Ligand binder design. Structure first.
Ligand SMILES: CC(=O)N[C@@H](Cc1ccccc1)C(O)(O)C(F)(F)F
Ligand SMILES: *[C@](=O)([C]([C]C1=[C][C]=[C][C]=[C]1)[N]C([C])=O)C(F)(F)F
Lengths: 10, 97, 131
């Protein structure tokens, strides 16, 4: 859980 | 007011309940966790969404958008449901259904 | 979110949109696995509402979203709507969501996990950007 395939970028 | 078509995001800090009580007083309960008062604010429509914190590449649901400033003031802390206080119930409900 | 920013499409795979039968977005939610969504109890969800996964632009018709029916609504018995405490509800889907690049689960913490004041986290959603 918790690891997006598409990495969020802040 | 303005409602976005596209999903929004914002980084914001967690506050202590003791400190948050400086803004909300007795409205703050153990099952709540405050975050914000940092220049951003959750607002109407964000309700129910996640407040996630990253550690070692993974995101954990620490809060659920609950309530806050009636005007979504960015200098007031938003109040979220504290997931650590509610996860046992989540695990149980899932296991039983 | 006021003063937030647009997210990278599909980068918050657990983020779902709760919409009523008219397609109106009224609350956010988070997938914790293929069959369950965690949201706020005050969202007043009923089985006539729907869970939409894989969405980014709600004004777009070209996204391959998953409109999932809700089989049951579990409002935490501890929930107090007048003080808005223990504000959590679980939604059991009629049919499991199909996990993919844009749809997956967020992690849940252990009840004893400590999240210190000062820790920077992130919140997401389609709420007002201007009050
Ligand atoms: C039907 C509607 O209100 N919007 C949909 C998207 C949409 C937007 C514009 C034209 C068609 C569909 C949606 O958000 O409910 C989705 F879940 F189906 F994605
Ligand atoms: C919910 O979106 C809002 C979210 C919110 C508003 C203002 C400050 C912080 C969070 N919650 C409430 C109780 O209004 C929704 F209820 F409007 F749906």
């Amino acid at each position: 859980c918790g690891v997006p395939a598409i990495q969020p970028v802040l | 007011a303005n409602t976005p078509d596209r999903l929004q995001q914002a980084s914001l800090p967690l506050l202590s309940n003791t400190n948050c009580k400086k803004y909300w007083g007795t409205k703050i309960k153990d099952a709540m966790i405050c975050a914000g008062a940092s220049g951003v604010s959750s607002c109407m429509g964000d309700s129910g969404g996640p407040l996630v914190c990253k550690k070692n590449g993974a995101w954990t649901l620490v809060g659920i958008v609950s309530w806050g400033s009636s005007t979504c003031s960015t200098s007031t802390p938003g109040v979220y449901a504290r997931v650590t206080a509610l996860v046992n119930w989540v695990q149980q409900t899932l296991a039983a259904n | 979110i006021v003063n937030g920013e647009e997210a990278v499409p599909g980068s918050w795979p657990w983020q779902v949109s709760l919409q009523d039968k008219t397609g109106f977005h009224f609350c956010g939610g988070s997938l914790i696995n293929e069959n369950w969504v965690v949201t706020a109890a005050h969202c007043g969800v009923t089985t006539s509402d729907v869970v939409v996964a894989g969405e980014f632009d709600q004004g777009s018709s070209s996204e391959k979203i998953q409109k999932l029916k809700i089989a049951k609504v579990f409002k935490n018995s501890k929930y107090n709507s007048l003080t808005i405490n223990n504000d959590i509800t679980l939604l059991k889907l009629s049919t499991a969501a199909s996990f993919s690049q844009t749809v997956s689960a967020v992690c849940l913490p252990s009840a004893s996990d400590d999240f210190a004041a000062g820790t920077t986290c992130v919140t997401t959603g389609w709420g007002l950007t201007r009050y």
